[PDB]
């Protein structure tokens, strides 16, 4: 139960924004060009 709970919160922490505009990487790479996308990219990489 402890391993499954840690695995479940490891999966579930992708849904957090960590200050970025969206949790999913693909739509923010689809809707921002890189020199202002990278501020959201750095926050997502830091949180994950």
């Amino acid at each position: 139960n402890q391993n499954a709970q840690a695995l479940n919160t490891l999966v579930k922490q992708l849904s957090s924004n960590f200050g970025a505009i969206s949790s999913v990487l693909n739509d923010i790479l689809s809707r921002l060009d890189p020199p202002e996308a990278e501020v959201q990219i750095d926050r997502l990489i830091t949180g994950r």
């Binding site: 739509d27 689809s30 809707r31 921002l32 060009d33 996308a37």
Partner: protein
């Protein structure tokens, strides 16, 4: 909209300007009004006046 050179203040946060046709949006809220000349800065998220 992008290729029209009559505008000078396209000025788009949120979705980036150069890749805009590729997403399929759900609700577009086309508001319209007329303002005083130096109030360009107050229509922006955060700047108050």
């Amino acid at each position: 909209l992008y290729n029209s050179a009559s505008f000078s203040t396209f000025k788009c946060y949120g979705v980036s300007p150069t890749k805009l046709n590729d997403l399929c949006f759900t609700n577009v809220y086309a508001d319209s009004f007329v303002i005083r000349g130096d109030e360009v800065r107050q229509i922006a998220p955060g700047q108050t006046g």
